[PDB]
Amino acid sequence: NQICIGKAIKPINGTVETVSRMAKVTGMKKVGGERMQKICAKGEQIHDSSSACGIVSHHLKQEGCDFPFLLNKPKFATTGPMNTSTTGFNFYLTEKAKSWMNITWRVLGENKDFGDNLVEKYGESGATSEGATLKNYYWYVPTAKPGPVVYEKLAECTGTIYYGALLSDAEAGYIAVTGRNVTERWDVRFTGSSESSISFSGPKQSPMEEYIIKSVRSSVDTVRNIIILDSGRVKKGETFSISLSSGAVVIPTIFCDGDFAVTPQVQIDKDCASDCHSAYGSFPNGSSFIIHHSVHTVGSCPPSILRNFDVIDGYEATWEFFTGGIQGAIDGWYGVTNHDTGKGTAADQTSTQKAVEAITNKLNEAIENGNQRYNQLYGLARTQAELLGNLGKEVNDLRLETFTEFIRLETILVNTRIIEEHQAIGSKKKEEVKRLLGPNALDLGNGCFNLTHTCDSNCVNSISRGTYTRENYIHNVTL
Amino acid sequence: NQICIGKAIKPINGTVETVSRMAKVTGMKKVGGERMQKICAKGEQIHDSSSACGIVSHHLKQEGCDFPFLLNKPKFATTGPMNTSTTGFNFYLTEKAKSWMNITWRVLGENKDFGDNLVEKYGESGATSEGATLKNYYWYVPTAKPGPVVYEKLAECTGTIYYGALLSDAEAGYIAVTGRNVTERWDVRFTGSSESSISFSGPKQSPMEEYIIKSVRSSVDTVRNIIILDSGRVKKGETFSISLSSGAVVIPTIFCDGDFAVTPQVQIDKDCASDCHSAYGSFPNGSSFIIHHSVHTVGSCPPSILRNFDVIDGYEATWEFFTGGIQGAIDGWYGVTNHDTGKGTAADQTSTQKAVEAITNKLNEAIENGNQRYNQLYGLARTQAELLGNLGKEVNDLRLETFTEFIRLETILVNTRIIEEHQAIGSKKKEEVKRLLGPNALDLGNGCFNLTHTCDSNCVNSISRGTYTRENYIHNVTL
Amino acid sequence: NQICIGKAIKPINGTVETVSRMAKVTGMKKVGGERMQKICAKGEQIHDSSSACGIVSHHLKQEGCDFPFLLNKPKFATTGPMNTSTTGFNFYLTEKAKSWMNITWRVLGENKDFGDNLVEKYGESGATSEGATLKNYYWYVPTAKPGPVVYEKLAECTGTIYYGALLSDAEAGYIAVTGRNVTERWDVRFTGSSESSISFSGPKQSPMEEYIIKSVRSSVDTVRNIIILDSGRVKKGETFSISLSSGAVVIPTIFCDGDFAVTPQVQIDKDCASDCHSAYGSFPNGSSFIIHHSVHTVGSCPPSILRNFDVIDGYEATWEFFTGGIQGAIDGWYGVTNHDTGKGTAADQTSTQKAVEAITNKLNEAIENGNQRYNQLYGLARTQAELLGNLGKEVNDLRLETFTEFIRLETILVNTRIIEEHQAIGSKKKEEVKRLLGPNALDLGNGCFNLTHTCDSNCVNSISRGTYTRENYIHNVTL
Ligand SMILES: *[C@@H]1O[C@H](CO)[C@@H](O[C@@H]2O[C@H](CO)[C@@H](O[C@@H]3O[C@H](CO[C@@H]4O[C@H](CO)[C@@H](O)[C@H](O[C@@H]5O[C@H](CO)[C@@H](O)[C@H](O)[C@@H]5O[C@@H]5O[C@H](CO)[C@@H](O)[C@H](O)[C@@H]5O)[C@@H]4O)[C@@H](O)[C@H](O)[C@@H]3O)[C@H](O)[C@H]2NC(C)=O)[C@H](O)[C@H]1NC(C)=O
Ligand SMILES: *[C@@H]1O[C@H](CO)[C@@H](O[C@@H]2O[C@H](CO)[C@@H](O[C@@H]3O[C@H](CO[C@@H]4O[C@H](CO)[C@@H](O)[C@H](O[C@@H]5O[C@H](CO)[C@@H](O)[C@H](O)[C@@H]5O[C@@H]5O[C@H](CO)[C@@H](O)[C@H](O)[C@@H]5O)[C@@H]4O)[C@@H](O)[C@H](O)[C@@H]3O)[C@H](O)[C@H]2NC(C)=O)[C@H](O)[C@H]1NC(C)=O
Ligand SMILES: *[C@@H]1O[C@H](CO)[C@@H](O[C@@H]2O[C@H](CO)[C@@H](O[C@@H]3O[C@H](CO[C@@H]4O[C@H](CO)[C@@H](O)[C@H](O[C@@H]5O[C@H](CO)[C@@H](O)[C@H](O)[C@@H]5O[C@@H]5O[C@H](CO)[C@@H](O)[C@H](O)[C@@H]5O)[C@@H]4O)[C@@H](O)[C@H](O)[C@@H]3O)[C@H](O)[C@H]2NC(C)=O)[C@H](O)[C@H]1NC(C)=O
Ligand SMILES: *[C@@H]1O[C@H](CO)[C@@H](O[C@@H]2O[C@H](CO)[C@@H](O)[C@H](O)[C@H]2NC(C)=O)[C@H](O)[C@H]1NC(C)=O
Ligand SMILES: *[C@@H]1O[C@H](CO)[C@@H](O[C@@H]2O[C@H](CO)[C@@H](O)[C@H](O)[C@H]2NC(C)=O)[C@H](O)[C@H]1NC(C)=O
Ligand SMILES: *[C@@H]1O[C@H](CO)[C@@H](O[C@@H]2O[C@H](CO)[C@@H](O)[C@H](O)[C@H]2NC(C)=O)[C@H](O)[C@H]1NC(C)=O
Numbered sequence A, B, C: 001n002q003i004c005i006g007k008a009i010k011p012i013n014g015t016v017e018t019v020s021r022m023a024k025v026t027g028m029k030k031v032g033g034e035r036m037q038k039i040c041a042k043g044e045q046i047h048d049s050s051s052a053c054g055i056v057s058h059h060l061k062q063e064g065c066d067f068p069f070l071l072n073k074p075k076f077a078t079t080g081p082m083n084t085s086t087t088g089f090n091f092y093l094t095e096k097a098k099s100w101m102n103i104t105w106r107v108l109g110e111n112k113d114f115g116d117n118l119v120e121k122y123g124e125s126g127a128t129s130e131g132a133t134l135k136n137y138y139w140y141v142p143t144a145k146p147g148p149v150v151y152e153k154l155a156e157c158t159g160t161i162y163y164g165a166l167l168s169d170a171e172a173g174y175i176a177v178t179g180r181n182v183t184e185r186w187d188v189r190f191t192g193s194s195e196s197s198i199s200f201s202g203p204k205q206s207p208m209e210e211y212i213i214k215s216v217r218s219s220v221d222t223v224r225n226i227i228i229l230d231s232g233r234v235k236k237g238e239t240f241s242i243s244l245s246s247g248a249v250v251i252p253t254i255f256c257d258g259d260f261a262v263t264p265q266v267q268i269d270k271d272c273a274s275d276c277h278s279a280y281g282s283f284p285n286g287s288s289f290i291i292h293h294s295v296h297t298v299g300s301c302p303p304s305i306l307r308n309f310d311v312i313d314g315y316e317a318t319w320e321f322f323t324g325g326i327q328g329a330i331d332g333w334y335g336v337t338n339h340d341t342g343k344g345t346a347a348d349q350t351s352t353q354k355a356v357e358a359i360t361n362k363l364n365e366a367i368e369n370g371n372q373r374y375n376q377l378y379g380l381a382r383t384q385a386e387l388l389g390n391l392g393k394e395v396n397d398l399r400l401e402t403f404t405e406f407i408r409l410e411t412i413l414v415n416t417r418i419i420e421e422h423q424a425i426g427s428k429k430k431e432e433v434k435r436l437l438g439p440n441a442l443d444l445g446n447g448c449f450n451l452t453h454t455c456d457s458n459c460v461n462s463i464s465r466g467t468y469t470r471e472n473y474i475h476n477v478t479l
C-alpha cells in the first residue's frame, strides 16, 4: 500500500516564544526555582539572643553577647532591635555606622584583632569604671594631652573599622579628658579605601549638644559617658591611617567581609533539609535559577532572577487526510505507520533519544552562558557583605533587572535552537528512510512514501530497525 | 489553460531591517510621534507672574506670589529667574537648594503644612518687622538661648523641606538672637531620607562672611536680615528629625511630589487642543512613543525615546515568466489570475484582512512589551519631580539611551514576526487552493497550477470564493 | 549524462555561532586586534624626568620641571612618584587632589593661565623667601586682614583648578599671615561645575595638627611653610567662584582636559612604528577593535573591548552519492561538474566575488553599528582625562562590559546575515542555470540536473560562462 513517518500525536500543552513566532508545544516547564512556604533548617544551629543582646552589644563584646567572636557561627541569627539599651556607655551612631552595623554583627568569616599593636604603640588604654562589662575598645588618653598622632597600619583583610570618640557630659570631665577648651571643634578622620571624618566639641556647643539628645540611654542611669561611632572601610593590601587625638576611641577589630547570616522571618521547621535558604523560605534542590529579590542567601545558591520564564519540554505541534501526525498510540515521539493501529505502527527510540539529548545540551549551554554573564556583571571575586553594604537603604537592584532581561532574551534563543535541532533531526531521519527504501519507491514529498507493491505490517516494522530488504517484497505491482 | 495565485504587484516603497536580512517592502511607517512646531493649549489655564515674583517668593508665600498654595494649578507656569530680589529678607541658597527650588515651586500636587504642630510644641514664632510681607516661615527663638532641641515628626507625603537659619549682619543682633559667642561654629542638621547639614558662625567669621557677600539683596535697602536655606528630603512613612537651636528657621511646608508644570519656550497657540505637551512643542494625539530627550511632560504621555524607527506597513516584494507577483490591477493584496487582465483576475479579501490583523496584533504586542520594559526600568511608583531632581544639573539620561536601544532591537523582531506571519498565511492559502482544486491537476510548485481542461475567466472567478466544482469542467483534455 | 553544481569541498576549519544554530565553516578570523609584547615608538620623543621631578613640582613649575607648560608635549612621559620631596614648601594634598594630579600633570592640551587677572584685581602676590625656586602660585595676603572676598571668573576651558592655603608652623607666623585667632576654623570654598571646600585652623588645633604630620617634608629642613591643596572642576561656558580669605593660595592655571600621555611599563623599542599605543604595548595597524581594559591610549585608536570573538571568513560546509559538495579541486568557492575531475570540473568567479563582497559589506556595517553604539554609550563630546578622573580609584568600567556584550551580540547577527546572503546567492545561481538549460531537462531537486543527451566536458565547461546552446546537443537520447 503506502507508508508514512512523522511525530506521535499528543494533546497540546502550551505555547512558547520563539525568535520569529510563537510555537505550540506539547510540554513545557519553568527555568527558575520557586520559593517555598517555610525554612528547612534540619541539622543546623539557630542563634537567637533577642532577649538580652543588641546590635551594638555584639560589636562591643558585652558579656553574654559575642556572636562575631564565636567559633562555629550558626547560619541563622537573630537579635534585638537596633535601638536596644546596653549595660555600659550611652552610644550614638552615624547613619553610615547604622547601615554597616546592621550587617557586620553577623559575618561568618574570621575577624582580625589589632588592639595589641595599639597597646605597644601608645601604651595602655584608658580605664573607666562605667565600662566594666564591656571589653572591646581602645581609649587613647596620653599623658601629654591632646598630643595628636597618626596611626598607620597595613590591613590584613577587607572589612569595616569603627572609630570615634568617648566623652562625658559634665564640662569638668570633658576638659580633664580631652585637655581642649570647650569652644573648640576637633575632628577624627579615617583614610582607608574611602575617606571619612567626624567632628566633636564641648557638651554645651554644637554639634555634641545634639549627640547627648540623640543618644541611647543605657540600662544603668548613673553613667555620664557617651561613645560616638562612625565606620570606615579598608582593603586587604593597602595601608589605612587614623588621626587620633586625646579622648578618641576605636573598636580594635577588622570585621572581615564575606557571607553573613540571615534573620528568619517565616516559620522555622525541622525534619527537612535544603541547600539554598533565604529570609522568607528555602528553595528546591538543584535549581538552575532562583526567584528572589536580592543576592542575600546562605548555602549553595545559584544566581537570582525576579520572574520565571517558560522553556520547551516536548516538541512543536505541526498538525491539525495526512498532516504530519500519527493517529495511533505509540511509546515514543517519532514513529512510522501504514494507516493501521495496534500492530501496523511502530516507534523508533533513536530519534526520541536524540531529541531529549538536544534539549538537555541546549539547556546546559544556556545555563553556562547565564552564569558567565552573572559573573561578568557582579565580578568573580564578589562578596555579599560589601554588595549589600554599598547598597545601603536602597531595596531595588538595577543589576538584577539587567540580569532578568538577559535571561528573558536567552530563553527565546534556547527555544529557537531546540526547535531548529528537532527539525534537522526529522529531516535527516526522513532522508535516511528515503535512501533505505530505494529509487523505485515513489516519494510523496510530505513525509509519506508510496510503494509499487503491497506493504503489510511486517513490511512496516522491518523498516523500524532498518533490516528491511527489497527481495522479499518484489512480488505484485500496485500504485 | 493554467491558473496562478500570488500577490498584487505594487511599487516598492523602501527597505526595513529584518533579523537575518533587509526586506524590500511596499510601505512602512514610523513607530514614534514627532514634536510639532507650536504648543496646543486650548482650554487650559496659563500662569505668568514673571514681572512681579520669583522662585523664592512662591516658596515663602509673598503677597501676590502663592502658586504652590493655589487650588487649581495651571499646567503652564512662568516666573522670574532664581536671583530675583524679594520684598522681605536677603536670602542665600545652597546649590542643592537651587536645584530643588527650580522644581518644587511649580508642583501640581497638594502641599502639606505642619506649622501648627511647631507652634504648640515650641511656642510662638519669632517676630521681625522686615518680614511683614512674607507669611510662611517659623523662627525658633526660645526664652533661654540657645536651648538646643530635636524636632521629630512623621511625614505625610514625599517631598522636600527647606530649613536653615535667619541671622542679622551686626554682631549685636547675632549675639542677641543666637546667644552664642562670635568665635563659635554651630550646625543645623536634617535627618530624613538622607542626611544634610549646614554650618554657621559669627558675622565677621567664616563661613558666614561669604554668606553676606554671596547673598541676594532685597528690594528694600534697610534690611539687615539674611536667611540661609538648605534642602532636605523626606519619606511618606518614616519620621524625619531636625536639630533646632536658637535662631534656626524652617519653612513649614512639605512640597509633595508629583507632576510639575512646564515653562513654555515656543509660541503658545490657542484654537487647537492636544494631549501630550512639552516645553518645546506639543505632540500628536494617540502616539505610541514620543521623540523626546527627557521624561518631563504634562497630560497623558507615552514613553519617550530619542529617535524614530521604521516598522512595516505593507508586505515584502518577492518578485522581479512568473516570479510570484500579479501584473493585473486588483483591489487588495492577494489574488488569483490566469494571465488575463480586467476580467480574468480576481482578488480575495480574506488574505488581505488576515495580513492587516497580523500587522495590528504584532504592533500591539510590541507596544505592550515596550511599556512593560519602561515600567521595569523606571519603576511603577515613580514621579517626574524626584526623577528630574535626582538628575540635578545633568542633562544626559542613560536610562533613555537604554530604552531607545531596546526599542531599536524590538522593531527588528516586529518586522521579522510580521514577515513570517505573512509567509505562513500565503502557504496556508496555497495549500487550501491545491486541496480544493483536486488531485487530477498538475502542480507546478511555484504557486501556479496547470489543469487538464481549459479554465476560462469564469473558471478563475469560481475558485475565488471556493464555490468551484469539478463537474462542469470535465469537458476536453489539454496539457 | 548528468550535471551538478555546488561548492568546492575544503577541510573544515572551525565553528561559528549563529542565532539559531552552530555553523561549521572552512575559515574564520577574530574581530578585534590583540596587544603585542613591546611598544613601537619610532619617530616619537619620550619624556623621562623621574630622577629630579615629582608630580606636584610639575604643577608648581619648579626649575627644570615644566611638562605642563611645554609646546610640543611628548606622547610618552615618566616622572617620580607622588610622595617625592620638592625643593620649596612642604605640601599636602587631598585624596581628590591626588587622584586629579595623577592625571593633570601630563595633559597634552593647552593650559590657560589667569594669574595676571588676579594680580590686577587684588594687587601683588604674597612674598616668601622659601619659595624662590617655585614660580606658579598666587598667595593672597591683603593689607587689611582677613578681608574676605569672592573671586568670580568665566572659565576659558574645561579643566581642574587647585586651591587651598599656604600656612606656617609657628603660631606667630600664622597669626601674622592670617590675622585670625588660633581657636578659629575658617573655610575655603570652590563653586564651579561642582562644590568643594577645605578647612583650616591654628597650628595646635584640628585639622591642621594632622596636616603638619601628614605633610611631605622638603629637601631643605629649615622651612616652616606648608601648602595644602585641593581640586575643583570648572566648565567651559559657565563661571567659577572662589571664596578667598587672607592666607589662601591658588594655582592660577586651568589644566584643560584632553588626551594625556601614557607611562610605559614594558620595553620601549625603536626601529618600528604603529598607530595605537597602550601603557603595556602597541596594537596592530588598521585594527577594527582593541582588546584593552580601559579607554586610555595615545594616537588614533578604535573602540576597546575586553575579549575577542570569531567571525566567518569562508563558507558553511553543508555536506558529509551527491550531498552538495564537489570532489574535484577548483580555484574558487562555487563550481559545476559532471563527476569528472581534471577537465569536467569548472568554477565560476562571479559567485566567489559576490560572496567576498557580501562578507566585506556585512563586516563594514557591523563596525559602523559598533562605533555608533560606542558614541551613544560614551557621548560624542567625551574626553579621556575627565573619563578617567571621574572613575577615581575604580579599575572596573561597567560601560566597557556593556559595550563588549553588545559586540558579542552583534557578531552573531553578522554571521547570520553572511550565511543568509550566501544561501541567497546559491539559490539565485541554481535558479538561473535551471532556467538557462530549459524545460526539457529533468530536475533532480538536489542541485543536480539530468540531461536527455550526453553532456561531455566541453558541454559542462561551456555552461560555466553561459554560452551554452541547445542546437548542437540535440543528438542522441538518454535517460
Ligand atoms: C538590615 O538589612 C536587611 C537586609 O540587608 C534588611 O532586611 C530588609 O527589610 C525590609 C523591611 O523589613 C524588607 O522589605 C520587606 O520585604 C518583604 C518581602 O516579602 C514579600 O513577599 C511577597 C509574597 O508574599 C512578595 O510579593 C514580595 O515582593 C516580591 O519579591 C519577589 C522575590 O522575593 C519578586 O520576585 C517579586 O517581583 C515581588 O516584588 C518584588 O518586591 C521587592 C520589594 O520587596 C522589589 O524590590 C522587587 O523589585 C520586586 O518588585 C516580597 O517578597 C515585604 O513583604 C515588605 O513589605 C517589605 O518590602 C527587605 O526585603 C529586607 N531585605 C532582605 C534582603 O531580606 C533590614 O531591614 C535591615 N535592618 C535595618 C534595621 O535597617
Ligand atoms: C530647571 O529644570 C529644567 C528641567 O528640569 C531645566 O530645563 C532645561 O534647561 C536647559 C537649559 O535651557 C535645556 O538645555 C537646552 O535644551 C535645548 C533643547 O532644544 C533642542 O531642540 C533641538 C531642535 O531645535 C534639538 O536638536 C535638541 O536636541 C535634540 O533633542 C531631541 C528631543 O527633542 C532628541 O531626540 C535628539 O537626540 C536631540 O539631541 C538631544 O539633546 C539633548 C540636549 O538638549 C540631550 O540631552 C539628549 O541626550 C539628545 O542628545 C533639543 O531638543 C537646546 O536647544 C539648548 O542648546 C540646551 O541644550 C534643557 O533641555 C532643559 N530641560 C528640559 C527637560 O526642558 C532648567 O534649565 C532648570 N533651571 C535652571 C536654572 O537650571
Ligand atoms: C594614575 O592613573 C593611572 C591610570 O589612570 C593608574 O594606572 C593603573 O594602575 C593600576 C595599578 O598599577 C593598574 O592595575 C594593574 O594592571 C595590570 C595590567 O596588566 C595585566 O596584564 C595581564 C597579562 O599579563 C592581563 O591578564 C591583565 O588583565 C587583563 O586585561 C585585559 C585587557 O588587556 C582584559 O581583556 C582581560 O580580561 C584581563 O583581565 C582584566 O583585568 C583588569 C584589571 O587588570 C580588569 O579591570 C578587567 O575587568 C579584566 O578583568 C592586565 O592586562 C596588572 O598586571 C596589575 O596587577 C594591576 O591590576 C591599571 O591597569 C592602571 N591603569 C591603566 C589605564 O594603565 C595609576 O595607578 C594611577 N596612579 C596612582 C598613584 O593612583
Ligand atoms: C535536598 O538536598 C539535601 C542536601 O543538603 C538533602 O538532605 C540530605 O539528604 C540525604 C539523603 O537523604 C541525607 O543523607 C542527609 O543527611 C541530608 N542532609 C541533612 C543535613 O540532613 C535533602 O534530603 C534533599 N531533599 C530532597 C527533597 O531531595
Ligand atoms: C486631540 O485630542 C484632544 C483630546 O484631548 C481633542 O480635543 C477634544 O476634542 C473633542 C472632539 O472634537 C472635543 O469634544 C473636546 O472639547 C476637545 N477638548 C478640548 C480641551 O478642546 C482634539 O480635538 C484632538 N485633535 C485631533 C486633531 O484629533
Ligand atoms: C604601521 O603604520 C605606521 C603608520 O604610522 C607605519 O609607519 C609609517 O610607515 C610608512 C610606510 O613605510 C613610512 O613611510 C612612515 O615613515 C612610517 N612612519 C614612521 C613614523 O616611521 C608602519 O610602517 C606600519 N607598520 C606596518 C607593519 O604596517
Ligand SMILES: *[C@@H]1O[C@H](CO)[C@@H](O)[C@H](O)[C@H]1NC(C)=O
Binding pocket: A001, A002, A450, A479
Ligand atoms: C498512493 O497509493 C495508494 C494505494 O496504495 C493510492 O490510493 C494513492 O492514490 C497513491 N497516491 C498517489 C498520490 O497517487
Ligand SMILES: *[C@@H]1O[C@H](CO)[C@@H](O)[C@H](O)[C@H]1NC(C)=O
Binding pocket: A011, A012, A013, A014, A027, A028
Ligand atoms: C500541561 O502539562 C502540565 C504537566 O503535565 C499539566 O499540569 C497541565 O495541566 C497541562 N496543561 C494543558 C493545557 O494540557
Ligand SMILES: *[C@@H]1O[C@H](CO)[C@@H](O)[C@H](O)[C@H]1NC(C)=O
Binding pocket: A081, A082, A083
Ligand atoms: C526602638 O525601635 C522600635 C522599632 O524598631 C520601636 O518599636 C521602639 O519603640 C523603640 N524604642 C525606643 C525606646 O525608642
Ligand SMILES: *[C@@H]1O[C@H](CO)[C@@H](O)[C@H](O)[C@H]1NC(C)=O
Binding pocket: A179, A180, A181
Ligand atoms: C583656653 O583658652 C584660654 C584663653 O584663650 C587659655 O588661657 C587656656 O590655656 C586655654 N586652655 C587650654 C587647655 O589650652
Ligand SMILES: *[C@@H]1O[C@H](CO)[C@@H](O)[C@H](O)[C@H]1NC(C)=O
Binding pocket: B001, B002, B450, B479
Ligand atoms: C502548462 O500549460 C500550458 C498550456 O495550458 C503549457 O503551455 C505549459 O507548457 C504547461 N506547463 C508545463 C510545465 O508543462
Ligand SMILES: *[C@@H]1O[C@H](CO)[C@@H](O)[C@H](O)[C@H]1NC(C)=O
Binding pocket: B012, B013, B014, B027, B028
Ligand atoms: C513611501 O510611502 C510614503 C507614504 O505614502 C510616501 O510618502 C513616500 O513618498 C513613499 N516613498 C517612495 C519612494 O515612493
Ligand SMILES: *[C@@H]1O[C@H](CO)[C@@H](O)[C@H](O)[C@H]1NC(C)=O
Binding pocket: B081, B083, B084
Ligand atoms: C540674574 O541672573 C540672570 C540670568 O538668569 C542674569 O542675566 C542677571 O544679570 C542676574 N542678576 C544679577 C544682579 O546678577
Ligand SMILES: *[C@@H]1O[C@H](CO)[C@@H](O)[C@H](O)[C@H]1NC(C)=O
Binding pocket: B179, B180, B181
Ligand atoms: C563667651 O566666652 C567667654 C569666655 O571665653 C564666656 O565668659 C562667655 O560666657 C561666653 N559667652 C556666652 C554667651 O556664653
Ligand SMILES: *[C@@H]1O[C@H](CO)[C@@H](O)[C@H](O)[C@H]1NC(C)=O
Binding pocket: C001, C002, C450, C479
Ligand atoms: C540521471 O542520469 C543517470 C545517467 O545519466 C542515471 O543513471 C540516473 O538514474 C538518472 N537519475 C534518475 C533519478 O533517474
Ligand SMILES: *[C@@H]1O[C@H](CO)[C@@H](O)[C@H](O)[C@H]1NC(C)=O
Binding pocket: C012, C013, C014
Ligand atoms: C584554521 O585556519 C587557521 C588559519 O590558517 C589555522 O591557523 C588553524 O590551524 C586552522 N584550524 C584547523 C583545525 O585546521
Ligand SMILES: *[C@@H]1O[C@H](CO)[C@@H](O)[C@H](O)[C@H]1NC(C)=O
Binding pocket: C081, C082, C083
Ligand atoms: C613613597 O611612595 C613609595 C611608593 O609610591 C613608597 O615605596 C615609599 O616608601 C614612600 N616614601 C615614604 C617616605 O613614605
Ligand SMILES: *[C@@H]1O[C@H](CO)[C@@H](O)[C@H](O)[C@H]1NC(C)=O
Binding pocket: B183, C179, C180, C181
Ligand atoms: C581674638 O579674640 C579676642 C577675645 O575673644 C579678641 O579680643 C581679639 O580681637 C581676637 N583676635 C582678632 C584678630 O580679632
